[PDB]
Amino acid sequence: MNHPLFTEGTYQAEVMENSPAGTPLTVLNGPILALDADEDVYAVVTYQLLGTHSDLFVIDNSTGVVTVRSGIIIDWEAFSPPFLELLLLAEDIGQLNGTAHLFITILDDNDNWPTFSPPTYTVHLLENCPPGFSVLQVTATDEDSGLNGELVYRIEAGAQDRFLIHPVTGVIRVGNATIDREEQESYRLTVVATDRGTVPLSGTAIVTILIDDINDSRPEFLNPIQTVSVLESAEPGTIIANVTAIDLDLNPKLEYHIISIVAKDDTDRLVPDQEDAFAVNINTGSVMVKSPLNRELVATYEVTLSVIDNASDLPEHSVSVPNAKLTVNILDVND
Binding site for Ca ion (CB under 5 A): 75-77, 108, 110-112, 142, 144, 148, 180-182, 195, 201, 213, 215-217, 232, 247, 249, 294, 296, 309, 312, 332-334
* Angstrom distances, CA of residue 275 to CA of 34, 135, 305: 118, 53, 12
State whether residue 252 is helix, strand or coil: coil
Which DSSP category does 71 fall into?
A: S
CB count in 10 Å sphere of residue 280: 24
54: partner contacted, choices K ion, Ca ion, none (Cβ within 5-8 A by kind): none
Closest CB 231 distance from Ca ion, rounded Å: 10
Q: How many residues does the chain have?
A: 335
For K ion, the closer CB: 35 or 231: 35
Closest residue to K ion, judged by C-beta, is 43
**CA-based angle 58:64:70, to the nearest 5?**
15
What residues numbered 37-56 form the site for K ion, per CB under 5 A?
43
State whether residue 322 is helix, strand or coil: coil
Burial class (CB in 10 A: 0-12, 13-18, 19+), 278: buried
Closest CB 94 distance from K ion, rounded Å: 5
36: partner contacted, choices K ion, Ca ion, none (Cβ within 5-8 A by kind): K ion
What is the greatest pairwise CA distance in the chain? 151
Sketch the per residue contact string, 74 through 113, with K ion: x for CB under 5 A, - otherwise.
------------------xxx-------------------
Phi-psi region of 217 (alpha: psi -120 to 50; beta: other; left: phi over 0): beta
Say what the alpha-carbon torsion angle 171, 172, 175, 177 is, to the nearest 10 degrees.
-150
For K ion, the closer CB: 98 or 114: 98
Contact 300, 279 (CB under 8 A): no
For Ca ion, the closer CB: 97 or 194: 194
For K ion, the closer CB: 94 or 272: 94
Q: Which of 81, 144, 77 is nearest to 114 (CA)?
A: 144
Closest CB 193 distance from Ca ion, rounded Å: 10
Closest CB 5 distance from K ion, rounded Å: 11
Question: What CA–CA distance (Å, rounded) separates 48 from 292?
Answer: 118
For K ion, the closer CB: 42 or 118: 42
After which residues does the chain break, using C–N > 2.5 Å? none
94: partner contacted, choices K ion, Ca ion, none (Cβ within 5-8 A by kind): K ion
Q: Rule CB under 5 A: say whether 199 interacts with K ion.
A: no
Sketch the per residue contact string, 8 through 37, with K ion: x for CB under 5 A, - otherwise.
----------------------------x-
For Ca ion, the closer CB: 92 or 195: 195
Closest CB 35 distance from Ca ion, rounded Å: 38
For K ion, the closer CB: 42 or 161: 42
For K ion, the closer CB: 92 or 249: 92
Closest CB 44 distance from K ion, rounded Å: 8
Total of residues contacting K ion (CB under 5 A)? 5
Phi-psi region of 18 (alpha: psi -120 to 50; beta: other; left: phi over 0): left
Specify the pairing of strand 98-107 against strand 10-16: parallel
Q: Which residues bind K ion (CB under 5 A)?
A: 36, 43, 92-94
